[PDB]
Amino acid sequence: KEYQGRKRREFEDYIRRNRLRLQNWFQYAQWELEQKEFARARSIFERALDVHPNNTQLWIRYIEAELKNRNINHARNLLDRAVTRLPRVSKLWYKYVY
């Protein structure tokens, strides 16, 4: 818990310093996934989507992060939201059909 406190403090500090760098959100969400904290990882991805709503790389990362953990219903909700938000991006549609 103390180690997770350090890592969360550092990651949130760098979120607060540069919210437009995607690597901060990606590394924070990846680290929280590796701790098997799924609600926190979903929260980090959702906040990153608040900051960067039309980013295809972030959308694919959040979909694949929830597909690697067999959260199929979650990921299908994500894919519907992704191809609703970005209807003219062929990669999201390809990923949903695949």
């Binding site: 609600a39 929260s43 219903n73 909700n77 939201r81």
Partner: peptide, 15 residues
């Protein structure tokens, strides 16, 4: 608690 919680929106699939 989860800092600045932003829960995923519900879709057409039960989770």
């Amino acid at each position: 608690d989860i800092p600045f919680e932003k829960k995923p929106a519900p879709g057409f699939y039960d989770t």
